[PDB]
């Protein structure tokens, strides 16, 4: 069964760095495009970035300065090394597979399978 | 007064129902043609 599990969220100080994981099972990244999407408490889903199968990275151009998406194909997992987390970086971070194949209807987000997402909050303690 | 209906004992799996306006010395002659072509 195709299932995406994220881990690594929690409390994080302002101005620090926090690494997130997208340990995937049921499929490999050698032929699929993978995306990271955030979710504010008061706003909708905001697309962070995308990892292609050949290693090509694209990011949100208002968020390029502080995210990094990498793979570990030996462990079939995706990495997200975020730095300098401020107050608006509090989000529930979903990792999802892109649908470049057949789409049964119109999708607002273009994702065929989603993750449960991990929650990150930034405050004093 | 119509008070006797004995045409069936059960009705299990329906696929089509259609309620319509009534079609109807011997005084009336009623001709009907029923055909089953391509369903």
């Amino acid at each position: 069964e195709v299932q995406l599990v994220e881990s690594g969220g929690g409390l994080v100080q302002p101005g620090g760095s926090l690494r997130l994981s997208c340990a995937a099972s049921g499929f490999t990244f050698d032929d699929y495009a993978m995306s990271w999407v955030r979710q504010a408490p008061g706003k909708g889903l905001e697309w962070i970035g995308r990892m292609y199968n050949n290693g090509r990275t694209s990011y949100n151009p208002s968020l390029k300065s502080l995210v990094t998406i990498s793979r570990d194909n030996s462990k079939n997992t995706l990495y997200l090394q975020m730095n300098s987390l401020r107050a608006e970086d509090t989000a529930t971070y979903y990792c999802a597979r892109d649908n470049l194949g057949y789409r049964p209807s119109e999708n607002l987000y273009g994702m065929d399978v989603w993750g449960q997402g991990t929650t990150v909050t930034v405050s004093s303690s | 007064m119509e008070s006797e209906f004995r045409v069936y004992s059960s009705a299990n799996n329906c696929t089509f129902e259609y309620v319509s306006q009534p079609f109807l010395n011997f005084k009336n002659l009623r001709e009907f043609v029923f055909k089953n072509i391509d369903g």
């Binding site: 049964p104 209807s105 119109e106 | 329906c14 696929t15 089509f16 129902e17 259609y18």
Partner: protein
């Protein structure tokens, strides 16, 4: 109904306007399988069940 005792209603012998369902903002989930939602009004269907 409850999900274990889910109700099924036959829709038949009528004209169905699916453009008022897909364009409605009331539905949070609208996932169609085997048919496009904008092509629904251009097809005629048999054995429709809700």
């Amino acid at each position: 109904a409850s999900v274990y005792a889910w109700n099924r209603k036959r829709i038949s012998n009528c004209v169905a306007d699916y453009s008022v369902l897909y364009n409605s903002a009331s539905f949070s989930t609208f996932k169609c399988y085997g048919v496009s939602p904008t092509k629904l009004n251009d097809l005629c269907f048999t054995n429709v069940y809700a």
